[PDB]
Design a protein around this nucleic acid. Structure first.
Ligand SMILES: [Zn+2]
Lengths: 132, 186, 95, 149, 102, 44
RNA sequence: AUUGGACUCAACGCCGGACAACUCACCGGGGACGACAGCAAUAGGCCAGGCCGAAGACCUUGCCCGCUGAGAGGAGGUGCAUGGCCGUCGCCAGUUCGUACUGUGAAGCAUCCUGUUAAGUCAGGCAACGAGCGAGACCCGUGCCCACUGUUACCAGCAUGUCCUCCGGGACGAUGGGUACUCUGUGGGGACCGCCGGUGUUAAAUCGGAGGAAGGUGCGGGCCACGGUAGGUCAGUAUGCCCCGAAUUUCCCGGGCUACACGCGGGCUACAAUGAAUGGGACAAUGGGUCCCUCCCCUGAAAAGGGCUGGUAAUCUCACAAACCCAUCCGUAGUUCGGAUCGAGGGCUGUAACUCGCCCUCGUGAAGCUGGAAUCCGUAGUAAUCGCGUUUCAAUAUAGC
């Protein structure tokens, strides 16, 4: 009926409560219409697996999103992974899973983690001060 | 809360070492009943702890209450469970043996031999301080298992440290003690 | 010559002259005074020879004219008082 | 629904600014021409309709962000404060500007007094939904598959 | 509905979980409506210090990270049940907190 | 307890470089020595 | 007086040392300060005033230790007497002991050659055999799965409180409710070069294949030996001796460490359409706060003032993140791109703001225009960058973390 998963690999912080269902076709992506989707500059990065699914699929589908936080680009790819998982959770084919894994995974965990715990001796995690 | 409890458990019987070290101080364990804050002393020779008609026991009351907010200031006087396993009074005994006329060459050797005969995985008494001449030296004794990096130096192994106020200078001891427990059967 | 002509400045009120002075002096005088500057004010209103010893004090309206002496690390120094320096700090003249 | 979120924020906020300009109860009070937008920026605003647009933006912020206190509004309305050779703190907005705008909003009845700020009143929500229907009327022909199909 | 809340936040969580299981078994013996053991966030109190005592010496800082393990549990209220909960042998490593909300 | 360096740390009579953080009131050397005895540990 | 320690690595944002009183350790000026002993002759207190910065400090007055020694003590000395601590050789793999054995002997062999490894890590062959400390193992960091898991976290349907009417609901998770799926923090599994295709030898060891969260130190960290470097540590701590024992003890006042012809080290800002106004969206965690951050209300332009609310803290607040991006507005040049000094002014912090503070507002908008020799940091969410808490707590962080 309704799919609720926020696991996306968690790019830094994600907070993407998935909500995908089936209705008349009216799709409201996180209290925002898809025609006038408010982020706009980041929706190009977010509309990749939905574009791969097809207009007929997501027109058939119906999706909502509940969110808490996360950085803007971490949101822009973690929410895309969450939408891909919600796409595959609904009764579908494995061809969409093949296409989703084909371009750049977007079902996996972000292998590059949050940060690296910078040590005393320099400004950054690996960088250090200037030695004359 | 926990910080004040750790501070009291590290300080209350450790400032008692300024006067209780003559009686055979060996540290203490905190037994904090909600009714009262019990404090224990492990006296090697608690006859001096008994006091000259209470002269020794009744010196541990004013400080406990005037600035720490404690109820029923009391310290029962007991002894440590094992003599050689406690390293603190072993270091005190080695420093006293140096100061008293015992063989300072052989005092550390006898102390190490006694500690390793008492059922230890390993021990090492190392004496940094000018024993004979005007220059510092070292008198390390190596025997038994003493691991230096990892969990055992954190909690499994312990330390016995004392002082020695000689006319040339002040030194001490660093008797490492490890309780006889298997680490890894690898 | 602060707020008015120089003649009536000595007879001005404490808070009116403070409002003539900036915010720093006004708040310095606003939150009371310690014992030393009260003693200095009392002796100035008596008229004896005065060694102030305070390098931060504020010159008063009727306190002008008479000479003030200030401790300068080395012992003391005598300095004149003028209409230009009223409301200033005592340590501004003997570094 | 004719919610505000079915339209871009720019057109809706400009519509609300125009409707507040039509209303005489919102005015630039006296010191609009000698005080900046707060404390962060360098100079006062150059746009002609800065006060009405600021009130409309504060209305939209109260609607989309719930009841907001005046200091929350000041924190939202900060900026990259120039210090010269100092590490560029972001301080606050302005208390009097935000408070006068909010008082104009409540006198207009759109903002509703609450303990943790002033949540937007229900009448303002209904009128802004109707204005959203107006602006959505400008793009009703985008998706015909929305009425009951 | 009435609940008696339990708040604990300490240094050793093993005896904390043991006391939680002891209270759970007391509730199952007494049939008290219970909320399960809820892992709260652990206070990771940290304060570092430079290792080097003297003047010369490069970057040497021993960081003192400490975890304060929090746990919030809710159970019902009852006089014999509360006396049973108050007579439990809880270790010194945790602090026991109660809120009798009725 | 309000001053620049008037308050001293425990044990070490000292008026500078004292850890008043966490209500500890210890010098950095003294607190470094006794943190392992007072329950503190360098877990990381 | 502009106090000392420290001088390549490994001194020069270090001594948590961002010194307004303390910090204080340099000094101006006082004043108190010798346990015991010898010896001169128990002193102070107490009206007021003289002077005294002032201090019944001591005096005219009201009026119930002089000193040495030995002491504490001494931020004086010697880090070249030390204890213990740390930099560093240095993550460096080294250091080694027993037995026998070669050697007149110091010493040798093990501790060697071949590969291998992050490593004396390991295998193979040896006059070598075994063993310890370091190493690794070990403890941590976080990511895939589950056992229970909800508050103050959570809405994810169940249902309500107001509008859209095109109709599911949009907003509400406060709640009833549901912990359906999740974040969850206590116990557990995972990924061992394990299998397969190359190499090395058929060993120790080595590449893509795995639909798999990490294939072959998953990824980053603490602990880091035998010793020296007479390295720093008498200035965190205790301490030997020389010394100071009425000053190097000891308590405030003022100055000073900020003073500056000046050499040098590290940091903060800067010259584009990659930039000044106006909006838009929710965004991050670490970690604070109850004697302190601040809820909302009122007042001003600001800093901020009053009142009043939340917090012993998954409640609550500092708390907006900026950088950002866009209808856009915005303009062509070394100037709205670019801001050091100084003059009036209002602030809170403190017992005190001239030396010596920071906040705020205005007017002067300058120097300057990607910087040679030389160097410097750095291999993945790392450099870089943009801002963020915290520590030096009264402010002030261009700083460390
Ligand atoms: Zn100390």
């Amino acid at each position: 009926m309704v799919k609720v998963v926020n696991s996306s690999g968690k790019h830094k912080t994600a907070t993407a409560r998935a909500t995908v269902m089936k209705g008349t076709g009216k799709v409201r992506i996180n209290k925002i219409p898809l025609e006038l989707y408010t982020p706009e500059l980041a929706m190009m990065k977010i509309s990749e697996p939905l574009l791969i699914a097809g207009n007929d699929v997501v027109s058939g589908l119906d999706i909502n999103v509940d969110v808490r936080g996360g950085g803007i680009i971490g949101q822009a790819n973690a929410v895309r992974t969450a939408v891909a998982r919600g796409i595959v959770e609904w009764t579908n084919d494995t061809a969409i899973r093949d296409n989703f894994a084909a371009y750049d995974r977007n079902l996996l965990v972000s292998d590059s983690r949050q940060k690296e715990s910078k040590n005393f001796g320099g400004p950054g995690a690996r960088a250090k001060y200037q030695k004359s | 809360k926990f910080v004040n409890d750790g501070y009291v458990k590290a300080s209350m019987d450790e400032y008692f070492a300024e006067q209780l070290s003559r009686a055979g101080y060996g540290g203490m364990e905190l037994n904090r009943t909600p009714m009262g804050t019990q404090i224990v002393i492990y006296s090697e020779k608690p006859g001096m702890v008994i006091g000259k008609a209470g002269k020794v026991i009744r010196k541990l009351t004013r400080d406990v209450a005037n600035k720490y907010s404690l109820e029923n200031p009391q310290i029962d006087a007991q002894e440590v469970k094992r003599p050689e396993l406690n390293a603190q009074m072993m270091a005190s005994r080695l420093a006293a043996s140096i100061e008293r006329g015992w063989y300072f060459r052989k005092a550390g050797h006898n102390t190490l031999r006694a500690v390793m005969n008492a059922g230890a995985l390993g021990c090492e008494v190392v004496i940094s301080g000018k024993l004979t001449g005007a220059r510092s030296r070292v008198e390390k004794f190596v025997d038994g298992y003493i691991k230096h990096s990892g969990n055992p130096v954190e909690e499994v192994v312990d330390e016995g440290f004392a002082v020695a106020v000689k006319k040339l200078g002040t030194l001490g001891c660093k008797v490492r003690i490890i309780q006889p427990g298997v680490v890894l059967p690898d | 010559y602060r707020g008015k002509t120089v003649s009536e400045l000595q007879e001005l009120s404490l808070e009116e002259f403070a409002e003539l002075l900036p915010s720093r002096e006004r708040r310095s005088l606003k939150r009371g005074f310690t014992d030393g500057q009260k003693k200095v004010l009392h002796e100035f209103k008596e008229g004896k020879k005065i060694r102030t010893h305070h390098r931060d004090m504020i010159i008063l309206p009727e306190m002008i004219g008479k000479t003030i002496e200030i401790h300068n690390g080395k012992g003391f120094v005598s300095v004149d008082l003028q209409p230009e320096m009223v409301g200033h700090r005592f340590g501004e003249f003997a570094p | 629904m004719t919610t505000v979120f079915d339209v871009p924020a720019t057109e809706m906020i400009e519509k609300l600014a125009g409707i507040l300009k039509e209303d005489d109860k919102i005015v630039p009070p006296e010191w609009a021409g000698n005080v900046k937008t707060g404390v962060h920026k360098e100079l006062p605003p150059t746009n002609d309709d800065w006060w009405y647009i600021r009130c409309a933006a504060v209305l939209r912020k109260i609607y989309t962000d719930g009841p907001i206190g005046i200091e929350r509004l000041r924190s939202v309305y900060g900026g990259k404060k120039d210090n010269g050779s100092k590490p560029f703190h972001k301080a606050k907005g302005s208390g009097s500007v935000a408070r006068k705008t909010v008082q104009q909003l409540e006198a207009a009845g759109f903002l509703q007094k609450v303990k943790d700020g002033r949540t937007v009143s229900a009448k303002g929500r209904s009128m802004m939904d109707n204005a959203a229907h107006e602006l959505k009327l400008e793009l009703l022909e985008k998706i015909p598959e929305l009425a009951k199909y | 509905m009435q609940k008696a809340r339990i708040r604990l936040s300490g240094i050793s969580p093993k005896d904390l979980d043991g006391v939680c299981n002891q209270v759970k078994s007391i509730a199952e013996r007494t049939g008290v409506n219970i909320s399960g053991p809820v892992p709260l966030p652990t206070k990771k109190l940290v304060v570092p210090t430079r290792k080097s005592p003297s003047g010369d010496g490069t970057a040497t800082w021993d960081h003192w990270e400490m975890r304060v393990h929090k746990r919030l549990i809710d159970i019902a209220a009852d006089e014999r049940a509360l006396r049973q909960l108050m007579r439990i042998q809880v270790p010194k490593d945790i602090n026991i907190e109660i809120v009798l909300e009725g | 307890k309000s001053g620049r360096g008037v308050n001293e740390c425990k044990r070490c009579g000292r008026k500078q470089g004292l850890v008043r953080k966490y209500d500890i009131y210890l010098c950095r050397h003294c607190f470094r020595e006794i943190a392992h005895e007072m329950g503190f540990e360098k877990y990381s």
